[PDB]
From a paper:
In addition, we report the crystal structure of a bcPadR1 homolog from B. cereus strain ATCC 10987, the product of gene locus BCE3449, which we named bcPadR2. The proximity of these genes, similar as in the lmrR-lmrCD locus, could indicate that bcPadR2 regulates the expression of the ABC efflux pump, perhaps following a similar ligand binding and induction mechanism as LmrR. The gene encoding bcPadR2 (locus BCE3449 in B. cereus ATCC 10987) lies downstream from two genes, BCE3447 and BCE3446, which encode a putative ABC-efflux pump. DNA analysis indicates that the BCE3449 and BCE3447-BCE3346 genes do not share a common promoter, and are separated by another gene, BCE3448, which encodes a soluble protein of unknown function. In addition, residues 67–71 in the β-wing of bcPadR2 were found to be disordered and therefore left out from the model.
The bcPadR1 and bcPadR2 subunits contain a typical wHTH DNA-binding domain, consisting of helices α1, α2, the DNA recognition helix α3 and strands β1 and β2 (together forming the wing), and a dimerization domain, including the C-terminal helix α4. Unlike LmrR, but like the other PadR-s2 proteins with known structure, the bcPadR1 and bcPadR2 dimers have a completely closed dimer interface.
Author numbering:
A (entry chain A), B (entry chain A): 3 to 66, 72 to 107
Amino acid sequence: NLTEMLKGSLEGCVLEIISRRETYGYEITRHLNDLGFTEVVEGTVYTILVRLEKKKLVNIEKKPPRKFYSLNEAGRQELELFWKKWDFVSSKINVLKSSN
Amino acid sequence: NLTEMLKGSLEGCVLEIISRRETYGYEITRHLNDLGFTEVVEGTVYTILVRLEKKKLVNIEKKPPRKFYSLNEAGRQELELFWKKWDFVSSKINVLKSSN
């Protein structure tokens, strides 16, 4: 049960996945499952994709009815900020772990 | 602004701090600030300490009116689980980062 711990990082993982190429909810979910986040279900990814759309971080396209997501410039900018935040937070938590 | 990302890990960082020796809210807060989580304020630590008390993870002592916190056996058990969760979640997020 990693939900609470993973919650605050999950939007970024999704942005990272969408960055690699045009994709869609089902495939994002399976990619997160394949990574080892087996408890991540489609509805969790759906909700994230909605948040990313309202923040205007992704370009959308109805293709052959499915929405295809890729990153726009804001999205790439935002993904960069996420990883800088991740690197900082994780390094400091590991500095703390390092003493037990 | 690391609050959302740090939120799901902050209770564990506190448990880790209390584990090292008997301590109290102000000192825990300053320890987190000194680590680099400068936006962590006392009220955030207070709220966490309350959660840890209701989960019965800490022994409390009114000493010379301040409450002194140390870990009981449940608390040590729980801290161990937190770090196992942290190691898993962070390793998988870093596996993902490793491809950009």
